[PDB]
């Protein structure tokens, strides 16, 4: 496979802006859901999802083709909760029929973190929908239950390296786990929807138990009340991811800087841009326009 990045047609940057404040206004809105949490962190869980089934051997998988619309792909275990996010940006699809699937759940996921303070994160427009046959098959997003080995071997199906990998698992500070989503259960810090370096500080300073939960599943909990997957806790356990993590603690902005450049990385996979594409457009926070 070779997919060409195609702009909607005759769609600018103002276009997709429009967009981008139309998701942003409705998560200040509707900030009630899962206790207060708001639909940010269920948003940049499902960009990464439809992004992390690419598999760089075949071109397969990836955001191009937005098949997770399918059902196949839409009912995998993998991806229990993510109805959520799906339905909520359902009303913004009938708002601007135009823009693709792929574009659409990529960047629900770039409004989410910048709403939630995180760093600007350049996006480009360009994926097309694909048909229903082209939706990967199940089981190719990653399991908790493991290890740093089985980390660093899934990621290089992805080609992510080291650096990128600890980045990008800096997102876990957001949100929570649920039980009956995944059989996990709990948050992983205290500012669980605004963005912040709070994953790598707590994975260094609190005093984690491991414990099995209602599930039967182990999971590392702390005295403060969260909690830490195995495949999270591996980055303590590894020298080389532990470097880096200590480096994230230690400087927040070098982690903002570095999960910017591996984000955007992770939605662009499997997608060739032409060099007439537009350059990725930066857009500006609700805040920034005084909306
Ligand atoms: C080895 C890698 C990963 C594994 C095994 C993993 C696993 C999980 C699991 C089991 C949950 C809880 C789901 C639930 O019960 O609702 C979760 C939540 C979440 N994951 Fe990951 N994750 C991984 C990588 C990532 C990456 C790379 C990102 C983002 C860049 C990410 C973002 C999120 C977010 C934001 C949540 C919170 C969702 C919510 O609050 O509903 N994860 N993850």
Redesign the pocket.
């Known amino acids: 496979l070779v997919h060409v990045a195609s702009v909607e047609k005759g769609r600018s940057y103002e276009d997709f802006q429009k967009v981008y404040n139309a998701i942003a206004l409705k998560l200040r809105e509707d900030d009630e859901y899962?206790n207060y949490?708001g639909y940010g962190?269920?948003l940049?869980?499902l960009?990464?999802h439809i992004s992390?089934t690419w598999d760089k051997h075949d071109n397969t998988g990836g955001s191009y083709g937005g098949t997770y619309r399918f059902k196949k792909e839409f009912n995998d275990p993998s991806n229990?909760?993510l109805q959520?996010g799906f339905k909520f940006l359902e009303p913004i699809h009938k708002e601007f029929p135009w823009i693709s699937s792929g574009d659409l759940f990529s960047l629900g996921g770039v409004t989410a973190v910048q709403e939630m303070q995180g760093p600007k994160i350049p996006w480009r427009c360009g994926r097309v929908d694909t048909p229903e046959d082209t939706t990967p098959d199940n089981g190719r997003l990653?399991?908790?239950d493991?290890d740093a080995g089985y980390?660093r071997t899934?990621?290089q199906r992805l080609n992510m390296n080291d650096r990128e990998v600890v980045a990008?698992?800096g997102?876990?500070a957001?949100?929570?786990?649920?039980?009956?989503?995944?059989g996990?259960e709990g948050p992983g810090g205290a500012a669980?929807n605004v963005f912040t370096n709070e994953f790598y500080l707590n994975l260094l300073n609190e005093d984690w138990k491991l414990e099995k939960n209602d599930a039967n599943n182990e999971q590392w909990d702390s005295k403060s009340g969260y909690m830490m997957?195995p495949?999270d806790y591996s980055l303590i356990q590894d020298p080389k991811y532990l470097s880096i993590v200590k480096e994230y603690a230690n400087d927040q902005d070098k982690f903002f800087k570095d999960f910017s450049k591996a984000?955007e990385k992770?939605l662009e996979d499997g997608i060739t841009f032409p060099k007439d594409a537009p350059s990725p457009f930066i857009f500006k926070t609700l805040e920034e326009q005084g909306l």
């Open positions: 899962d949490i962190p269920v940049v869980r960009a990464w992390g229990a909760g959520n990653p399991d908790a493991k980390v899934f990621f990008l698992m997102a876990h957001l949100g929570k786990t649920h039980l009956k989503n995944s996990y669980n997957l495949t984000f992770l």
